[PDB]
Symmetry: D3
């Protein structure tokens, strides 16, 4: 079926050929398992770096967001140019445009759409519009934690939880599933799989629940 | 300065030639009084009708939203055509497009942008992007009340309050988030009084002013 | 081959395929409201076109995964969207005509030999509310039509007739209630009126 | 006041610089006198040669039309490029696009829009959309006659007539339908005389004026 | 395999249906053998008819270029319209658009993109962007000779050469050469009269000059 | 009259708030002096980083260029966004689009257009299309030298042919081949200067200051 893959921005800040090489194989691996793949790429450091520079000279919040969006699109193009042929050569700039590009039956790579949200929201929207039952959020963490492994000791990894639990835990910045994202995944009952992009090579396993991952169930 | 005017959908469901006429005279006042007006029109009943009909046959939530957006755009075109020669002849379909159309120095009429939100959000976004310090929400009510007068007795009208007060109580999430971060004040008023919009803005005529916090 | 299906607007008020949807009551509801405040004729037409497109989206969205997700706004755009090999739903294109004309244009551009006009009547008559003409020609229809404008056009307006004739496209007028019985109407003779180009 | 100027295709076949020269002049003069000018250029011989050639190898009628449209656009670009800095640098490809380009307040040059009609229809549509009360059709003849003036001797020019008078005889069906419903008067004149365009418009120079009815 | 076909402007001036008839035939041949084909059409005489006229009244060099581009696009439409159902119905106006239109898997016909270059450069760019290892330049002459064959008894066609041997010497501008070299695209110069023997040309069983990148 | 200002990519790599400001200034100055300004922003390090990352996994040369172009547009947006309502809110992606955006009478900010060239070429094209008689190339250097600075001196006046003799996604040049070809045929003079002096742009333009003026020939 259809599946949306949200690649965290950090993924591009790293500068190591192996990242793209592996993401590319996994996009193929997912393909050879009868999977249509949509990919959303975040802005990463390029985004933050420009948002800061822009903010420094007083650029309004709306425009700071656009800069982050454009930065996320630059990453989108990078992913796409390595997916060449395999992907539809256009980076939709709105959900409506995505819906169109998705018609062509190839992989579609997206960046941001609108100010006031994050690529997480985009991933949700795109997942909903593409009838994807699963939204994989590949980030630099292994999964979801009750508090924060960085600041609290032995906060064991929650391999399963609902949009309710994730709400209490979370109870241009973000989260991982900002408000709009959660709202969308819930109304369209899309399950979110948080995993480490280091394991994109074991995505097929992740999807069928055989590897370190956190699955958020809609409720 | 710049100002955004959010016209509730009900405004178009009434079909009384006087609504468009009055709205048309007011956009002209604001204009001949040093304002650049941006207008956001809601889907109204057309939106609901199509959403209803579409839902009935199982159209996904994303697509029901698109239908409401297109309906809101149809109202956008209606408002735009009557103001001809005061408005830029294009209904932007995204904030990015709005920003572009706004460059032309004329009135810009908009409908929805993206699924998952309401024209309220669009009005906020558009207000923020156009550096509008005030977002006027023209609806079928006089303003904000501590609880709806429909059900509680002796509910007067809050002539002033802040985002926090409004919290304790249309403005969807994104709208509030935007008006707060960019400190945009929202003026809730009755579209029946668009002929007194200049007064409203300077705090006279009956209205509820939501202050950002 | 290819076939174009023109869905009358009333439909919403209640083999490759191209679909054209009319504005219906939404179109006329706006057209009268717009006219009331003096909106020019060109713009009234645009309102009708937008209304027709709104219907186009509704139809498109329901056929999802069968239709190319874009509503062309001009013949040139249609030709392009048609390249993708999926169903294409269209609304109006230009002022001064009706979706009928669009259907014809679209039929011609797509090399469709048949244009099916599904309306709120079983076929072509001679007058409305009288017998049903089960088989006529572009000339007979042109005559059955006559003079005595955003909102109201004739079954097949001037441009539609001109197009169907020059490209020899046969027009099948039916009842959208029998849309389901299209494989037969089309190829049968059932309760349909077939207009032969001449 | 807005005014639409339809330049006959022949204008470009003469490979006459003198024609483009006088056009710029009049566009410049019209602008001066407070007129917004929309220009529609026909396909001319280029359109002819291409359609001919295309037809020869069996291209469909729809596509032959598109080729004439493209050829009319090529002329549109030529006129535009010469009007540079006075014209909006884009040749709209549909009435909807024209409406948009016209918002920018500069001269807009157009070619064809859709198959099945002629630039005359385009001129009419564009005139209607831009609220022009006059559509000037500039051809290689001083005006309307009852028979061709170059062949028939003793043909007198008809200075005034009606849409019907014309029917009872340069204007395709759509064009006439449009000029009538929107009551646009059409002035047929010789493009050799465009520089005297200001006189033509005020009934103080040779020309045929078709009154809508 | 992807391949780009550059049709010289003269091709359209003969008002030769003969030419179009054979182009359409070889596209079919190419499609029928699993070749994706991108086509670039030059402005030909139409281009110079409009440029000459424009220059006459002082239109700037940038705009003269645009006129030639539009002229080449008009030819692009003509070729496209005859390929109907075999080609994507849009004439990209920039390399970025071409890349997009090419995604659709059908034949793409192009004209010019930007001022300051020729369709040759467009053909090279498009070849590079579409990963075509071969760029066929169909001219009205069998290939490249040692001495001009126009008026020079039979001379002798040189079957092999390099982009360097090309420099040591129309239909080839600076950008074109830079591109074919950096992306190592081989260029085949051949007569458009022979465009249906195109399958042979490509494999060496037919007359032509092959420029090797270096 | 019109003038095109080419901002070197390094200008954005310094990530200095001041950089953006002084620009926003000169524009207002230049503007307030009967000058319409077109601005072309290069890709800088962002472009370069992507061009190398992309190349590492084998992305073709055409696509590496596109990445550079998009990176240069990102800078274009940044510059545009900082120029409040002074600039037309759209980053043209082709000369044809530039010509259109330029009609609106406001500042237009551009990035790349097409593979195979550099923003220098874009600046030249844009200058020619906009009838600009002068193309200002603001780089981090002070002007031109027959050898990049060491110990060499600054050639205050040379010709495009002088530059030729004096003179791959990434590969720079001051003026690449297309740029020179364009500036020559349309006789556009190019003023090479240090972007540190954007503030003194009005002086530069009238000869009074540290700059190298390349005369077309
Ligand atoms: O649709 C969008 C996307 C992004 N943005 C803006 O750009 C920025 C990029 O937001 P992202 O959510 O793309 O950042 P990221 O990729 O680094 O996130 P993680 O992978 O670390 O989870 C955000 O901070 C926001 O301001 C929008 O405004 N809208
Ligand atoms: O940006 C938008 C706008 C609208 N919509 C969708 O279309 C519908 C129309 O959005 P409205 O905001 O017009 O809804 P409403 O009709 O209740 O508004 P008012 O009476 O208060 O004016 C909403 O119900 C929403 O689902 C979007 O999804 N996104
Ligand atoms: O190409 C087009 C299509 C439509 N329109 C405008 O849209 C409006 C709707 O005209 P339609 O012909 O689309 O309406 P309908 O669906 O009710 O028609 P029937 O099938 O019942 O006969 C008309 O008033 C017309 O002005 C155009 O101007 N141009
Ligand atoms: O909107 C349009 C315009 C033009 N065309 C097609 O292109 C051709 C050009 O139509 P024109 O009306 O421009 O022809 P022309 O140049 O000979 O006209 P004059 O001003 O010289 O009298 C026509 O023959 C028609 O087929 C369209 O299909 N649609
Ligand atoms: O990308 C382009 C293509 C073309 N042009 C401009 O348009 C004209 C037509 O471009 P051509 O490529 O047809 O010129 P040419 O005369 O060398 O062509 P062939 O006989 O080899 O087919 C050229 O003279 C050029 O000025 C551009 O500016 N850019
Ligand atoms: O039109 C364009 C512009 C840029 N590019 C691509 O963008 C990349 C950046 O080329 P730039 O010329 O934008 O770099 P820069 O701004 O840092 O240059 P200087 O002013 O310091 O000399 C180059 O690698 C090139 O391939 C294009 O391909 N086309
Ligand atoms: Mg609502
Ligand atoms: Mg009708
Ligand atoms: Mg004609
Ligand atoms: Mg460089």
């Amino acid at each position: 079926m259809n599946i949306i893959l949200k690649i965290s921005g950090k993924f591009f800040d790293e500068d190591n050929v192996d990242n793209l090489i592996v993401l590319r194989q996994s996009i193929k691996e997912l393909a050879d398992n009868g999977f249509r793949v949509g990919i959303v790429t975040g802005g990463g450091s390029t985004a933050r770096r420009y948002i800061k520079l822009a903010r420094e000279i007083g650029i309004g919040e709306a425009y700071l967001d656009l800069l982050g969006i454009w930065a996320s699109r630059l990453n989108a193009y990078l992913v796409m140019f390595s997916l060449q042929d395999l992907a539809y050569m256009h980076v939709p700039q709105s959900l409506e445009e995505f819906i169109q590009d998705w018609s062509h039956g190839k992989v579609v790579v997206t960046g941001g759409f609108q100010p006031g949200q994050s690529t997480a929201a985009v991933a949700a929207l795109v997942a909903e519009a593409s009838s994807s039952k699963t939204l994989v959020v590949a980030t630099n963490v292994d999964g979801v934690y009750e508090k924060d492994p960085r600041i609290y000791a032995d906060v064991k990894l929650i391999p399963h939880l609902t949009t309710q639990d994730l709400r209490k835990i979370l109870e241009g910045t973000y989260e991982l599933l900002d408000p709009l994202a959660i709202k969308i995944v819930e109304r369209s009952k899309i399950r979110v799989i948080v995993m480490n992009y280091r394991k994109l090579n074991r995505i097929i396993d992740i999807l069928k629940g055989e590897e370190v991952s956190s699955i958020i169930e809609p409720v």
